[PDB]
C-alpha cells in the first residue's frame, strides 16, 4: 500500500496466533508488542533509557504478518504504551519513505 | 527520494536560518527541535506524558526546508533527545510509507 501520514499509520498484524494492531514507527529501531504469548526461546533486553530502563523479552526470528506481508524478525514483548512496528520489521516488508 | 529503513532516517533541514539534522519519525504526531531561535509568536505546549509532561514552545506556520522541500508547519521547540520531524511536517513534504 501507499500510506499517507495525515493519521497515525496503524496497521493490522498477525502474531503468535493473534490479530493485533500496531503503529508503523520509523523512529523506533525495534518492534515492541504487548499481550502476546510467543513460543520458543527468549532473553531479557533493556530498552528505553529515559528515567531508567524497561526490561522486555527478546524473541528472535519470530514469524509475523504485517498488513498481509509474511516476514520474520526480532520481536520485543513487554508493556508498551502502543504496539510498535520498528525499522527492523519495516525493512523486512520492504517499507520505504517516499517523497 | 526513496529512503530505506536499514538505518535511522536522518535528513538535513533548514530552520530559523540554521542547518540541522532531524529524524523522519512516523511514530511522532509533532515536530520537536532543540537549539533553534525562531522569530515571531509562540505559546507553551505540554507534550509527552510519561513520567510527567515536557513543556515546549509552539510556533505555528514556521517555514522549514526538509531534505530540499520548502514547507510550512508547526514546530515545537525545546528539549528533545533527538530532533524529530513528525507526521505534521511529513504530510507537508508529501512523504508516504510504501510497501
Amino acid at each position: 500500500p501507499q500510506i499517507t501520514l495525515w493519521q497515525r499509520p496503524i496497521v493490522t498484524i498477525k502474531i503468535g496466533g493473534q490479530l493485533k494492531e500496531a503503529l508503523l514507527n520509523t523512529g523506533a529501531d525495534d518492534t515492541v508488542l504487548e499481550e502476546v504469548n510467543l513460543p520458543g526461546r527468549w532473553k531479557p533486553k533493556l530498552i528505553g533509557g529515559i528515567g531508567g530502563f524497561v526490561k522486555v523479552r527478546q524473541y528472535d526470528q519470530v514469524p509475523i504478518e504485517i498488513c498481509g506481508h509474511k516476514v520474520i524478525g526480532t520481536v520485543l514483548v513487554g508493556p508498551t504504551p502502543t504496539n510498535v512496528i520498528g525499522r527492523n520489521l519495516m525493512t523486512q516488508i520492504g517499507c520505504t519513505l517516499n517523497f | 527520494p526513496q529512503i530505506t529503513l536499514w538505518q535511522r532516517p536522518i535528513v538535513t533541514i533548514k530552520i530559523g536560518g540554521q542547518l540541522k539534522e532531524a529524524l523522519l519519525n512516523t511514530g511522532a504526531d509533532d515536530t520537536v527541535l532543540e537549539e533553534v531561535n525562531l522569530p515571531g509568536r509562540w505559546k507553551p505546549k505540554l507534550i509527552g506524558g510519561i513520567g510527567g509532561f515536557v513543556k515546549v514552545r509552539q510556533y505555528d506556520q514556521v517555514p522549514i526546508e526538509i531534505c530540499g522541500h520548502k514547507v510550512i508547519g508547526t514546530v515545537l521547540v525545546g528539549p528533545t533527545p533527538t530532533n524529530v520531524i513528525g507526521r505534521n511536517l511529513m504530510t507537508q513534504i508529501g512523504c508516504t510509507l510504501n510497501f
Partner: peptide, 7 residues
C-alpha cells in the same frame, strides 16, 4: 531508540 510521540 523508540521515538514515538502521541503528543
Amino acid at each position: 531508540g523508540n521515538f514515538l510521540q502521541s503528543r
